[PDB]
Amino acid sequence: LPEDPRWELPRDRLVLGKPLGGQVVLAEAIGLDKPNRVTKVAVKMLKSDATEKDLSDLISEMEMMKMIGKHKNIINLLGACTQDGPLYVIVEYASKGNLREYLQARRPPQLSSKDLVSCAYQVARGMEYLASKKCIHRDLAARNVLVTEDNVMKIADFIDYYKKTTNGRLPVKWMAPEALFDRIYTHQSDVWSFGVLLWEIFTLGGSPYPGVPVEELFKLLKEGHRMDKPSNCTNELYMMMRDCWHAVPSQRPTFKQLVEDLDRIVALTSNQE
Ligand SMILES: Cc1ccc(C(=O)Nc2ccc(CN3CCN(C)CC3)c(C(F)(F)F)c2)cc1C#Cc1cnc2cccnn12
């Protein structure tokens, strides 16, 4: 592994902490920039039984993050430890966890309608930036959105159709029909995923199609079935979800259009309830 001086951080500057979920740990970086300050960071490293391909996957992930560049609404690369020891990929720390967890914790036994629209605007803004960088996410969902201490949404990324997430959810439930059935991945298939993410925001971390297995989901998709309008969701925001879920990919709005519409909606959405 060659030392990249734009990103390299000496090992003696990284104080490894508690695991966050290869494997991700919380850590403290001494002098990432003054040199006398600690910055809380998240570090990705390989698990004890990692393969040669697991290592090559972490390298390529790091190399891609280097090319994407900085944005307020994406989890940004901060550094790396590549010399004389295991590969550490260092990113910004998001203290309020993933957006699914963030939302569920703030359900009534708090977030206004304007905060929820702002959440959707921020994710759309991060997606617009990734698209401008010629990137396709493939796994956009609230679990892949991180929330910082200051409530900033940051897009992140942590195949068998039957494999479930830790929470017991099926990732096929976020996939556009053409991505699922024809293996065609585009910004248009990501916009379909963003529609499922809007539904997740407005149900405050609700699970899409609960109890629906893969074979039954395929049937719902073939029939042109669409998820119901969440409670406390405007007609305009439900039409946005439905447009994101257009059967014809060219007819779906783009992230650029979604940012413009969400920007306008945020400004007209009240923070009084
Ligand atoms: C350590 C770490 C390493 C890497 C990444 C990461 O997100 N990598 C990433 C890889 C690829 C892509 C884009 N591609 C998608 C695939 N696609 C096919 C090509 C384009 C992106 C993206 F943001 F751009 F989307 C990100 C996140 C973390 C974290 C963390 C962290 C911070 N706070 C907390 C709090 C709790 C838990 N974790 N945590």
Side-chain angles (χ1 to χ4, degrees), residues 1-32 34-36 38-46 49-51 53-71 73-158 160-162 164-182 184-214 216-230 233-273:
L1 258 93
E3 189 181 314
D4 186 347
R6 304 172 287 184
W7 294 109
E8 195 78 18
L9 181 81
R11 286 187 195 271
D12 59 28
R13 306 297 70 194
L14 198 66
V15 186
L16 309 169
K18 69 159 192 198
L20 293 162
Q23 55 164 320
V24 178
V25 306
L26 175 61
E28 280 163 310
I30 308 164
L32 260 175
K34 77 164 141 170
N36 294 312
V38 299
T39 318
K40 286 182 165 66
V41 292
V43 178
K44 193 162 170 190
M45 66 183 77
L46 291 164
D49 64 328
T51 57
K53 206 77 186 81
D54 284 327
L55 173 61
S56 66
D57 280 359
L58 189 62
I59 304 167
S60 52
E61 174 182 5
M62 180 184 66
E63 292 305 313
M64 185 176 220
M65 292 173 95
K66 287 173 181 185
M67 301 242 315
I68 290 164
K70 262 128 188 56
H71 194 265
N73 299 118
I74 64 152
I75 204 75
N76 299 299
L77 186 67
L78 298 180
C81 298
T82 75
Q83 309 300 289
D84 323 303
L87 181 60
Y88 295 152
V89 173
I90 310 157
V91 311
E92 295 169 328
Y93 173 54
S95 72
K96 304 182 166 165
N98 75 52
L99 179 59
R100 192 239 320 139
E101 293 165 343
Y102 176 87
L103 294 167
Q104 282 172 349
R106 287 151 182 85
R107 284 170 168 204
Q110 200 114 105
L111 301 159
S112 69
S113 276
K114 203 203 206 70
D115 294 322
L116 295 177
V117 179
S118 162
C119 286
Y121 170 76
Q122 288 177 63
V123 174
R125 232 198 176 165
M127 284 307 300
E128 179 188 43
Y129 178 77
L130 284 167
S132 78
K133 297 288 138 180
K134 273 82 179 210
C135 293
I136 295 145
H137 198 293
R138 262 107 143 179
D139 201 10
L140 186 71
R143 74 193 159 244
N144 287 316
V145 177
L146 291 175
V147 185
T148 68
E149 189 49 43
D150 303 310
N151 306 310
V152 176
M153 302 303 124
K154 283 179 181 284
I155 292 147
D157 192 16
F158 301 96
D160 175 39
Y161 293 159
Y162 295 85
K164 293 180 189 184
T165 57
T166 321
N167 208 208
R169 288 175 188 187
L170 290 141
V172 286
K173 282 165 180 178
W174 281 263
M175 294 182 63
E178 73 283 358
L180 197 55
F181 306 127
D182 313 329
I184 297 157
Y185 297 99
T186 64
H187 308 300
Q188 303 163 340
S189 61
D190 273 352
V191 162
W192 174 288
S193 299
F194 180 75
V196 189
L197 190 145
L198 292 166
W199 184 95
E200 287 185 275
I201 296 167
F202 295 116
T203 58
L204 305 172
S207 183
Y209 295 122
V212 173
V214 177
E216 302 291 341
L217 171 71
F218 290 175
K219 210 194 176 177
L220 295 179
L221 295 172
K222 298 292 188 178
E223 292 167 4
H225 188 276
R226 297 291 179 272
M227 288 188 289
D228 305 48
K229 180 169 122 184
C233 181
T234 65
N235 301 298
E236 183 182 39
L237 284 155
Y238 183 54
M239 280 307 303
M240 182 181 287
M241 275 175 216
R242 291 294 285 259
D243 295 344
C244 283
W245 306 325
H246 205 112
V248 188
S250 64
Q251 302 305 299
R252 288 173 205 159
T254 65
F255 283 114
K256 186 194 206 289
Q257 183 62 64
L258 291 161
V259 167
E260 285 183 44
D261 301 343
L262 289 166
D263 183 59
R264 178 189 47 86
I265 303 172
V266 178
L268 297 161
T269 311
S270 90
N271 41 197
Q272 305 312 283
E273 137 182 55

